[PDB]
Write a protein that binds this ligand. Structure first.
Ligand SMILES: CCC1=C(C)/C(=C/C2=NC(=C\c3[nH]c(/C=C4\NC(=O)[C@H](C)[C@H]4CC)c(C)c3CCC(=O)O)/C(CCC(=O)O)=C2C)NC1=O
Ligand SMILES: CCC1=C(C)/C(=C/C2=NC(=C\c3[nH]c(/C=C4\NC(=O)[C@H](C)[C@H]4CC)c(C)c3CCC(=O)O)/C(CCC(=O)O)=C2C)NC1=O
Ligand SMILES: CCC1=C(C)/C(=C/C2=NC(=C\c3[nH]c(/C=C4\NC(=O)[C@H](C)[C@H]4CC)c(C)c3CCC(=O)O)/C(CCC(=O)O)=C2C)NC1=O
Ligand SMILES: CCC1=C(C)/C(=C/C2=NC(=C\c3[nH]c(/C=C4\NC(=O)[C@H](C)[C@H]4CC)c(C)c3CCC(=O)O)/C(CCC(=O)O)=C2C)NC1=O
Ligand SMILES: CCC1=C(C)/C(=C/C2=NC(=C\c3[nH]c(/C=C4\NC(=O)[C@H](C)[C@H]4CC)c(C)c3CCC(=O)O)/C(CCC(=O)O)=C2C)NC1=O
Ligand SMILES: CCC1=C(C)/C(=C/C2=NC(=C\c3[nH]c(/C=C4\NC(=O)[C@H](C)[C@H]4CC)c(C)c3CCC(=O)O)/C(CCC(=O)O)=C2C)NC1=O
Ligand SMILES: CCC1=C(C)/C(=C/C2=NC(=C\c3[nH]c(/C=C4\NC(=O)[C@H](C)[C@H]4CC)c(C)c3CCC(=O)O)/C(CCC(=O)O)=C2C)NC1=O
Ligand SMILES: CCC1=C(C)/C(=C/C2=NC(=C\c3[nH]c(/C=C4\NC(=O)[C@H](C)[C@H]4CC)c(C)c3CCC(=O)O)/C(CCC(=O)O)=C2C)NC1=O
Ligand SMILES: CCC1=C(C)/C(=C/C2=NC(=C\c3[nH]c(/C=C4\NC(=O)[C@H](C)[C@H]4CC)c(C)c3CCC(=O)O)/C(CCC(=O)O)=C2C)NC1=O
Ligand SMILES: CCC1=C(C)/C(=C/C2=NC(=C\c3[nH]c(/C=C4\NC(=O)[C@H](C)[C@H]4CC)c(C)c3CCC(=O)O)/C(CCC(=O)O)=C2C)NC1=O
Ligand SMILES: CCC1=C(C)/C(=C/C2=NC(=C\c3[nH]c(/C=C4\NC(=O)[C@H](C)[C@H]4CC)c(C)c3CCC(=O)O)/C(CCC(=O)O)=C2C)NC1=O
Ligand SMILES: CCC1=C(C)/C(=C/C2=NC(=C\c3[nH]c(/C=C4\NC(=O)[C@H](C)[C@H]4CC)c(C)c3CCC(=O)O)/C(CCC(=O)O)=C2C)NC1=O
Lengths: 74, 172, 162, 274, 172, 162, 162, 172, 162
C-alpha cells in the first residue's frame, strides 16, 4: 500500500507524506492521445526526505499540480 | 504472475505434495483445448481496434453526457484517455483469457480499485458499461472468425466473459 | 494554461526566484496587446454560427461522397456533430485570443487529437478545410493586428492537424 | 595514418596510436622556425606489434604525448548498429494492469534507467516495486525513485565527475544527448547549491521530459531521431553515448567511469556565459 | 496553473459557451489596470529581502521564545529554514499578484502546508504572524514607491492583502 | 513464475502491447511440448519414493564418512531431513515439468540456495550427487522427449548448485 | 528484429542467463509453425502481382473520387506509387511469415507510419481497404494454418493503421 | 544563448566599456524593425508543416534513390527521421530569426553534421539541398502573407537566408 | 544570457516546439520596452564618471573609518579598486537595460558574488550603500519608465547583495 513501508528507502531525516492533484500538465500515457493519465492518479501520495522536501515541491508547483496535503510520514 | 498450471502448482505445494491425478488431468484438458484457446486470443488481438472503437461509439451513443462539457470523456485529452483504458480492460481481459485464473485481476484489478475511479469521481458503471460492450463484441469475434475449423468454443467464451465480468464488477 | 503571465511565473518559480524586470517587461507586452486581441475576440464572438454551417457544408462540397448515403457527412447526427466540432474549434480560438496564449487550444483540442480522430475515423483534412474557409471569411471581418491574431490561432490549429 | 584498413602483414596485431607532436617529429621544410601542420595536431598511426614499443619510446622522447592505444581490429568494426533503437518499442502502464503488464514495465525501466548494467536480484528495489503494482505511484516515480537510490548513486555518481554524471543523466532520463555546454554548466551549478536530490528532480519535472514521456511511459531512446531545439551535432553525440546493444553504462571498466563526450566537442555547439 | 483570464475561460467552457460580454469587460478592466499591477508586483520584488528581514526582526521581537533553545527558530539551521519559508510564501504571493488569481499560491504553496508544520512541530500561529507582518510591509511598499505616477492602488492593495490573508488563514 | 506463457505475456505487457503471432507461436511450443513433459512428470511422481531413497543412500555411499558419529549423515533427524530435501527437489522438478518452465525451481529452490546452504553447512556436492544418481535411474523409466525433459530439469538443478 | 528466437535470446541475455527449457520450448513453437507460415509465404509470393493490382483497384473502386483529376489516385505517378506501397506491405507480410514474428513489419512499416502518412496526406483508410481486399482473396489461395498465419499478419497491419 | 543585443554586450565587455554610440544605434534599428521581424518569424511558424512537406515532396522528386530500398529515406522509420530533422532545422532557423543572432543557429548548432553524415555516408550535398528547398519556400512565405502591412522585408529575408545557408554549408 | 528573447526561445526549444503567439507576444513586450530602457542606458552611460565618484565617496562618508590607515578604504589601490568595482556594477546595469533582462547581471556579477566577497573581506554593505546613493541621484537624471527601469536593475543588485 502507499501506506509507506518503513522509510521507503528515502533515508534522510524526517519523512513527509505529500499528496498532490497531479495533472496531465505532468505524466501522460505514451499513447497518441492528449497528455492525459489513467484516472486514479488524481491524488498522488508520495514520501520524501526532509532534505529533498523543498526541491520536490518546487518542481511540483512549477509543473502545475497543486499540493493537497502534507503530513509527517510516520 | 500465474497461469492455470502455475496455479495448480501453488495449491499442490501448500499441501507439500506432487500434483494430484485429479489436477493432472484438468491440466491435460487445458492442453487438449489449447488450439481453440490460441484462436480465441487471436480473435481479440486481430480485432482489438474495432472492439474498442465499436464499444466506444456505442458507449457515447448511450451516454451523451460524457461528451458534453462537464462530461468525463470531454475534451480531446479525456476522450483519448477513455479510448486508452477501454483498450486497457480489453487487453488485460484477453491476457486473462489465457491463465485459467482470475488472480491477474484479484492481485491488481480487484486490488486498490476502492480508492481509484471512486477517488476521482469517475462513474464506474459507465466504465463498466464500456467493459460490458467490449465483452459483447469481443465474444462476437471469438465466435465468428476467418476460416477457423468448426467446433464448440462456448467453454472459452464463458471464461473470457468471466474476465470481462471480473473487470466490470471490480470497477462499477 | 499557457499565457504570457503563467509562462514568466513558471520560469521564475522553477528557478526559485522573484519576478524581475525581465519578467515584468514580458507581462507588459501581454497587457499592451490586450486591446487588439480583445477586438478580434468581440468580432469573432458576435459573427459566429454561420461560420460553422459554412465550413460544415464545404466539407461535403469538397468531399461530395461525404453527403451521400453510407458516408460520414450524411444524416442529422453526423452533420450535427460536425457543426458542433467546428464550433468547439472557434470557441477555443476565441479563448486562446482572450487568454494570451495557445493554452486553451493545447489543453482542450490538441492534447489527444490524433488518437481520437484515428479511433473515430475522422480525417484531419476536413478540419483543415473548415479552418481554411474560416480563415478566408475572417479576412473581411477584421484587419490589422486583430486579423494577425485571428490568423495566428487558426494557422496554429491547421499545423496541429498536419 | 588516420582511419585504417586491415590489421597485419606477416602477422601482427596492429594498434593505432594517437599523439600530439612537437615539431621534432614532422616539420615543413621551410626557412624558419619548425612547425607541424596545424591539422595534425593530434596524429594517429597504426603500427604492428613489434615496432610498437620502439615507436612509443621515440614519440615520448622527441616530445610527444601519447593520447591512446587501441587495437586496430577493435576499431575497424565501425559504429554501432542502431536499428533496435532508432525507433524503439514504447512501454507504458495502464490504469488497472493484468499484473504481468506491470512485469513488463519493471524490467524495462531497469534496463533503460540503469543503462543496461546488470541489476542482480539482491539488488532490485522491491519495496518500490510494490508501490507501482498497487497503483500508488505511476511509471514516473519509479523513474524518479530509481534515480535517487543508492544503486543509481553508486554506479553513476559517486565514482565519476559531475560532467559525466550529467551526461549519463540525459541519456537515461531523457533519452537524448546533452546539447550544449550551457546544459552541462547549468546543471553543475544546481547540484552545487541545492544538492543531489534537487538536481535529480530537474530532469524528471522538465518540460521536455513531460512532453515525450508523459507520466505512464518508460523513458525510451529518442536521440537517434531529429528533435526540437536540438543542435545538429547532438546526433553524433548519441553515437558516442550509446555503444550498441551489448554496450552498457558500466562502472566496472578498467579505466573507470569516464566522459565519452569530449569537452571540446560540446563547445562547437555554442559558447556564451552563465 | 490559472491566471484571471484562464479562470474566466474554464467557467465559460463549463457552460459550453463563448465568453459572456459580462466576463469580457471584467477582463478588459484587468488589462486597463495592468500597469498599476506591474508596479505592485515590482514593489514586492524590489524590496523582497527587506520585506522578509523586517518581518523577521519584528516576529522575533514579539516571540522571543522562538530564538531560545527549545524554540522553533533555534539554532542557525532552523532560523535559515524559517527565513527561507518567509521568502517562499512572499514569492508565491507575488506570483498570484501578477496572475490576478490565487491558484498558484494555493496549489504550489498552501496545499498541505499546515499539516507539514504540525508534523514538524513548527508553531503555525507564529508562522501565520510572520505572514501578517510581511503583508504590512509589502503593502507599505506597494503604496509608497520610487517616482511612480500618482493614482489609486487600493483595489490592488486589497487583492494583495487577500493573498497574504489566504496564506495566513490556511496555515494558522 | 516463469513459464513460456508468463514470459510472453510479461514481454507484451512491458511494451504495452497485445499478444501477437510471435507470442502465440511461442505458446504453441509450450502446449505441443506438454505431452512429453507430463509423461516425465507422471513417471517421476510414482517412482518418487524409491528415487528419493536411492539418491539419499548414494549420498552416503559416495561420502561414506557422513554416516559416522559426529557427522551430518548420522542420526534419524539428519537422515530424515535429507530424504525430505531430495524429495523437495524431485517435487519441484515435476512442477517445472508440468508448468512448462523453470519457474518453480527458480522461485522455491534456486532463489536463496547458497545463502541457506552456507549458513547450515550443507555441501552442494551431496545434492549434485543425489541428482546425478536420480539422473542415472531415470534413464530406464523414460526415453525420447520425456527423458530429455527430465534431464533438462535435473541438469538445471546441478548447474544451480555449481 | 522481433522473432520468437530473438525474443527468447533477448530475455535470457537481459537476465545474464543461459537459454533454459522455457526458452527452448518457445523456439520449438516457431520451428513447428514454419511449415504453415512458409506455405502462406509461397502462395502470397507467387500471387503478389495480382494481389497488388487487385487491392490497388479496390482502393479506387471504394474511393471513386480518388481517380478524378486534381486528386491523389490520378496520373501515372500516384497510381504507380500506390501499387508499390501495397507491394511493400505484401512483401513485409511474407517476411514476417518467414521470420516467425512481426519484426519485419514493426521495423520497416509500423515504426514511423503515422508521421509519414500525415506529412504526405495519405489516408490509412485506403491502406486498410487494400488489405481488407487482399484478405478476401487470400481466403481461396490458402486454408487451415497457412490461412490463419496470413490472416494474423494482414490483420496486424490493419490494427497498426487504426 | 545569445541574441543580437547580448552579442553587442559581450563585445563591449571584452573592451571593458559601456556600449558605443555606434553599437547603441545598430540595436535601436533592430528595435525599429522588430514588428517586421515578428511577422517574419510568424510566417515560418504559421506554415511550418507545409514548408517541411513541400520541401520533402520536392527532395524526393529530385532524388528518387532515397526512397528505394538501399536509400536513406527508406523504410518508414527512416523517412520519419528525415522528416523530423527537416523540422528540427527549420525550428532552430526560426529561433535564430527571432533572436537576430545565429548564436542559436551557427553558434547553437552547425558542426558535427559534416563529419557525422560523411561518416553515416549521408550525402551532405543532398542534405544541403533539402535546407535550400525549405529556404525557398520559407522565404516565399515571409514575402507573401495574410494582410500584413505593405513594406520592404528584404533585409530580414536576407538574414533568414543566411541562417538557411549556414545550416546548408555546415552539413554538406 | 537571460533576456526575454532567450527565455521564450529556451522554453520553446525545451518542448521541441516552434515559437507560437504566446512567445511572440512576450517578445513584443521586450521590444516595446526598449525605448525607456535605452534612455536609462544613455543617461547612466554619460553620467557614469560622476555616478561612480559620487557612490565611491558615499561609501567613505557612511563608513568613515574605512579611510583611516590599516583599513580597506585607504591608499591608492583600495580606493582605485573600489571605483572600478562600482563602475563594473553600473556597466552591467546599462547592459541589463539594453539587453532586456537581468542576464548580464546574473552571469557577470551575481554568479559567485558571495564567495568572492567573503574570500576578499568585502562587505556587501558598502556596495548596497554605493547603489542606494546611485539610486538617489538617478532620481533627477530620469523620470517615468526610464527611471522605473533604472530602479528595477539597481534594486536587483541590492537584493542580490542581501
Ligand atoms: C501517476 C500517473 C497518473 C495517473 C494514472 C493520473 C490519473 C488522473 N486522472 C485524472 C483525470 C481524468 N481521468 C479520466 C479518465 C477516464 N474517464 C472515463 O470516463 C474513463 C472511464 C477513463 C479513461 C479510461 C477523465 C475523464 C478525467 C478528467 C475528469 C474531470 O476533470 O472531470 C486526474 C486529474 C488531473 C487531470 O485531469 O489531469 C489524475 C491525477 N494522474 C497521474 O499523474
Ligand atoms: C499461431 C498460434 C496458433 C493458433 C491460433 C493455432 C490454431 C489452431 N486451431 C486449431 C483447431 C480449432 N480451432 C477451433 C476454434 C473455433 N472453432 C469454432 O467454431 C469457433 C468459431 C472457434 C472458437 C475459438 C476449433 C473448433 C478447432 C478444431 C478442434 C481442435 O483442434 O481443438 C488447430 C488444429 C488444426 C486444425 O484443426 O485446423 C490449430 C493449429 N495453432 C497455433 O499454433
Ligand atoms: C473539446 C474539443 C473536442 C473536439 C474537437 C471533439 C471531437 C470529436 N468528434 C467526435 C465525433 C464526430 N465528429 C464528426 C465530424 C464530422 N462529421 C461530418 O459530417 C463532417 C465530415 C465532420 C465535421 C467537419 C462525426 C460525424 C462524428 C461522429 C463519429 C462517430 O461517433 O461515429 C467525437 C466522439 C464523441 C462523439 O461522438 O461526440 C469527438 C471527441 N470532441 C471534443 O470534446
Ligand atoms: C597553413 C598556413 C599556416 C598557418 C596559419 C600556420 C600557423 C602556425 N603558427 C604557429 C606558431 C605561432 N603563431 C604565433 C602567433 C601569434 N602570437 C601571438 O601572440 C599573436 C596573438 C599571434 C600573431 C598575431 C606565435 C607566437 C607562434 C609560436 C608559438 C610558440 O612556439 O610558442 C605554428 C607552429 C609552427 C611554427 O611555430 O612555425 C603554426 C603551424 N602555420 C601554417 O603553415
Ligand atoms: C628519445 C629517445 C628515445 C627512446 C627512449 C626511444 C624508445 C623506443 N623504444 C622502442 C622499442 C623497444 N624498446 C624495447 C625495450 C625493452 N624491452 C624490454 O622487454 C625491456 C623491458 C626494455 C629494455 C629495458 C624493445 C624490446 C623494443 C622493440 C619493440 C618491438 O619492436 O617489438 C621504439 C620503437 C622504435 C624502435 O624499435 O626503434 C622507441 C621509439 N626511442 C627514442 O628515440
Ligand atoms: C512549496 C514551497 C514550500 C514551503 C512553504 C515549504 C515549507 C517547509 N518548511 C520546512 C521546515 C521549517 N520551516 C520552519 C519555519 C519556521 N520556524 C519558526 O519557528 C517560524 C514560526 C517559521 C518561520 C516564519 C523551520 C524552523 C523549519 C525546520 C523544522 C525542523 O527541521 O526542525 C520543511 C521541511 C523541509 C526543510 O526543512 O527544508 C518544508 C517542506 N517547503 C516548500 O517546498
Ligand atoms: C517593466 C514592467 C512594467 C512596469 C512596472 C510598468 C509601469 C507603468 N505604470 C504606469 C502607470 C501608473 N502606475 C501607477 C501605480 C501607482 N500609483 C500610486 O500612486 C501607487 C503608489 C502605485 C500603485 C501600484 C499609477 C497610479 C499609474 C498611472 C495610471 C495608469 O497608467 O494606470 C505606466 C503608464 C505610464 C505612466 O503613467 O507612467 C507604466 C508603463 N510598465 C511596464 O511595462
Ligand atoms: C522448498 C525447498 C527447500 C530446500 C531444498 C530446503 C533445504 C534445507 N535443508 C535444511 C537442513 C538440513 N539439510 C540436511 C541435508 C542432509 N543431511 C544428510 O544426511 C545428507 C548429507 C543431506 C541430504 C543430501 C541436514 C542434515 C539438515 C539439518 C541441518 C541443521 O539444522 O543442522 C534447512 C534448514 C531448516 C531445517 O532444518 O529444515 C533447509 C531450508 N528447504 C526448503 O524449504
Ligand atoms: C518500406 C515501407 C514503406 C512504405 C509503406 C512507404 C510509403 C510511402 N508512400 C509515399 C508516397 C505516396 N503514396 C501514395 C499512395 C497512394 N496513391 C494512390 O493512388 C492510392 C490512393 C495510394 C495507394 C493505396 C501516393 C500517391 C504517394 C505520393 C505522395 C506524394 O509525394 O505526394 C512515400 C513518400 C516518398 C515517396 O514519394 O515515395 C512513402 C515513404 N514508404 C516505404 O518505404
Ligand atoms: C541542428 C539541426 C539538426 C540536424 C540537421 C540533425 C540531424 C540528425 N539526424 C539524425 C538522424 C537521422 N537522420 C536521418 C536522415 C535520412 N535518412 C536517409 O536515409 C535520408 C538520406 C535522410 C533524410 C533525407 C535518419 C534515417 C536518421 C536516423 C539514423 C539512425 O538512428 O539509424 C541525428 C541523430 C539523432 C536523432 O536520430 O534524432 C541528428 C543529430 N539534428 C539536429 O539537431
Ligand atoms: C504577436 C506578435 C506580433 C506581430 C507578428 C506584430 C506585427 C506587426 N507588424 C507591423 C507592421 C509591418 N509588418 C510588415 C511586414 C511585412 N511587410 C511586407 O510587405 C512583407 C510581406 C512582410 C515582411 C515580414 C511591414 C512592412 C509593416 C509596416 C512597417 C512597420 O511597422 O515596420 C506592426 C505595426 C502595426 C501595423 O502597421 O500593422 C505590428 C504590430 N506585432 C506583434 O506584437
Ligand atoms: C565583473 C564584475 C566584477 C566585480 C564586481 C569584481 C569585484 C572584486 N573586487 C575585488 C577586490 C577589491 N574590492 C575592493 C572594494 C572596495 N575598496 C574600497 O575602498 C571600498 C570599501 C570598496 C568599494 C566600495 C578592494 C579594496 C579590493 C582589494 C581587495 C584585496 O585584494 O585585498 C576583487 C579581487 C581581484 C582584485 O583584487 O581585483 C574582485 C573579483 N570583480 C569582478 O570581476
Amino acid at each position: 500500500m502507499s501506506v509507506l513501508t518503513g522509510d521507503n528507502q528515502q533515508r534522510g531525516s524526517k519523512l513527509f507524506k505529500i499528496t498532490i492533484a497531479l495533472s496531465p500538465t505532468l505524466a501522460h500515457h505514451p499513447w497518441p492521445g492528449l497528455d492525459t493519465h489513467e484516472p486514479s492518479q488524481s491524488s498522488y501520495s508520495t514520501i520524501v526526505s526532509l532534505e529533498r522536501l523543498l526541491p520536490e515541491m518546487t518542481r511540483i508547483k512549477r509543473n502545475g499540480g497543486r499540493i493537497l496535503e502534507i503530513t509527517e510520514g510516520e | 504472475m500465474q497461469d492455470a498450471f502455475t496455479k495448480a502448482i501453488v495449491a499442490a505445494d501448500l499441501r507439500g505434495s506432487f500434483l494430484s491425478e485429479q489436477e493432472l488431468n484438468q491440466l491435460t484438458n487445458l492442453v487438449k483445448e489449447s488450439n481453440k484457446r490460441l484462436d480465441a486470443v487471436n480473435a481479440i488481438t486481430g480485432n482489438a481496434a474495432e472492439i474498442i472503437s465499436d464499444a466506444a461509439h456505442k458507449l457515447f451513443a448511450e451516454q451523451t453526457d460524457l461528451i458534453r462539457p462537464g462530461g468525463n470523456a470531454y475534451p480531446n485529452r479525456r476522450m483519448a484517455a477513455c479510448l486508452r483504458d477501454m483498450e486497457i480492460i480489453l487487453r488485460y481481459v484477453s491476457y486473462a483469457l489465457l491463465a485459467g485464473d482470475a488472480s491477474v485481476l484479484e492481485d491488481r484489478c480487484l486490488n486498490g480499485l476502492k480508492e481509484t475511479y471512486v477517488a476521482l469521481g469517475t462513474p464506474t458503471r459507465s466504465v463498466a458499461r464500456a467493459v460490458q460492450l467490449m465483452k459483447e463484441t469481443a465474444i462476437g469475434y471469438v465466435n465468428s472468425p476467418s476460416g477457423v475449423t468448426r467446433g464448440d468454443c462456448s467453454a472459452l467464451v464463458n471464461e473470457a466473459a468471466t474476465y470481462f465480468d471480473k473487470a466490470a464488477a471490480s470497477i462499477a | 494554461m499557457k499565457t504570457v503571465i503563467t509562462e514568466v511565473i513558471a520560469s521564475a518559480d522553477s528557478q526559485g526566484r522573484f519576478l524581475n524586470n525581465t519578467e515584468l517587461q514580458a507581462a507588459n507586452g501581454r497587457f499592451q496587446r490586450a486591446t487588439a486581441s480583445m477586438e478580434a475576440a468581440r468580432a469573432l464572438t458576435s459573427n459566429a454560427d454561420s461560420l460553422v454551417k459554412g465550413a460544415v457544408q464545404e466539407v461535403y462540397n469538397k468531399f461530395p461522397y461525404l453527403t451521400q448515403p453510407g458516408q460520414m457527412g450524411y444524416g442529422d447526427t453526423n452533420q450535427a456533430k460536425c457543426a458542433r466540432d467546428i464550433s468547439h474549434y472557434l470557441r477555443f480560438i476565441t479563448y486562446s485570443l482572450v487568454a494570451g496564449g495557445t493554452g486553451p487550444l493545447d489543453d482542450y483540442i490538441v492534447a489527444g487529437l490524433r488518437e481520437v480522430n484515428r479511433t473515430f475515423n475522422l480525417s484531419p483534412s476536413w478540419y483543415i478545410e473548415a479552418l481554411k474557409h474560416i480563415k478566408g471569411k475572417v479576412g473581411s471581418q477584421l484587419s490589422g493586428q486583430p486579423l494577425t491574431e485571428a490568423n495566428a490561432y487558426i494557422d496554429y490549429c491547421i499545423n496541429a492537424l498536419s | 595514418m588516420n582511419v585504417l584498413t586491415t590489421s597485419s602483414q606477416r602477422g601482427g596485431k596492429l594498434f593505432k596510436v594517437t599523439m600530439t607532436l612537437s615539431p621534432a617529429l614532422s616539420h615543413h621544410p621551410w626557412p624558419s622556425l619548425d612547425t607541424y601542420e596545424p591539422s595534425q595536431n593530434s596524429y594517429s598511426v597504426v603500427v604492428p606489434l613489434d615496432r610498437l614499443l620502439a615507436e612509443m619510446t621515440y614519440i615520448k622522447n622527441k616530445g610527444g604525448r601519447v593520447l591512446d592505444i587501441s587495437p586496430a581490429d577493435l576499431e575497424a568494426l565501425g559504429p554501432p548498429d542502431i536499428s533496435s533503437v532508432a525507433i524503439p518499442l514504447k512501454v507504458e502502464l495502464w490504469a488497472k494492469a493484468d499484473v504481468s503488464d506491470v512485469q513488463a514495465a519493471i524490467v524495462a525501466a531497469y534496463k533503460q534507467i540503469f543503462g543496461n548494467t546488470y541489476v542482480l536480484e539482491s539488488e532490485r528495489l522491491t519495496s518500490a516495486e510494490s508501490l507501482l503494482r498497487n497503483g500508488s505511484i505511476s511509471v514516473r516515480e519509479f523513474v524518479r525513485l530509481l534515480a535517487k537510490s543508492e544503486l543509481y548513486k553508486e554506479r553513476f555518481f559517486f565514482c565519476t565527475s559531475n560532467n559525466r554524471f550529467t551526461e549519463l543523466n540525459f541519456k537515461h532520463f531523457l533519452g537524448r544527448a546533452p546539447y550544449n555546454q550551457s546544459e552541462i554548466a547549468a546543471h553543475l551549478d544546481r547540484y552545487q547549491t541545492f544538492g543531489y536530490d534537487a538536481e535529480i528532480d530537474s530532469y524528471i519535472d522538465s518540460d521536455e521530459y513531460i512532453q515525450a514521456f508523459g507520466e505512464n511511459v518508460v523513458p525510451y531512446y529518442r536521440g537517434f531521431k531529429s528533435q526540437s531545439g536540438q543542435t545538429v551535432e547532438s546526433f553524433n553525440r548519441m553515437f558516442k553515448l550509446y555503444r550498441g546493444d551489448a554496450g552498457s553504462d558500466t562502472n566496472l571498466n578498467l579505466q573507470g567511469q569516464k566522459r565519452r563526450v569530449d569537452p571540446k566537442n560540446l563547445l562547437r555547439s555554442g559558447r556564451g556565459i552563465v
